[model samples]
Target: PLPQAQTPVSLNEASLEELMALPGIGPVLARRIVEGRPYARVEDLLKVKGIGPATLERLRPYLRP
Candidate 1:
């Protein structure tokens, strides 16, 4: 199932805990996702330390503006 959107979230602005709350994400991966730096696009999460294209593809449906 897709993740539910709560309030608006900015990849560049969201906290690590917020990032970790997403489906398929864990605390360690969440830190890496944050460490990858500010994201201009939500899809840029695929470039984070642990995320891959497959994960990004899986997450695309639930991620939003």
Candidate 2:
């Protein structure tokens, strides 16, 4: 059977490339996520430009605080 999950990325530690690797995260969005560093929770990603509840929900599975 297929593995159900990949290694979760820490939002506070991930670089631009790591952030970009996640679903719905692009260069611009990744940069924004990086600049607004030290997220206390994955939900903080919603503060980044272009990230909405739907996009945050999509990324939740692969992210950690």
Q: What are the C-alpha RMSDs, in order, of all predicted structures?
A: 3.0, 3.4
Cα deviation in Å at residue 44, candidate 1?
2.0
Where does model 2 exceed 4 Å of error?
1-6
| Candidate topping lDDT | 2
Q: Distance (Å) between predicted and true CA of 14, model 2? A: 0.6
lDDT score, candidate 1, position 22:
72
Give the lDDT of residue 16 in candidate 1.
79
lDDT of 1 by residue, 1-65 (tens): 22456434456666877777677888988788778876778877877777888887766765642
Point to the candidate with the largest TM-score: 2
lDDT of 1: 0.70
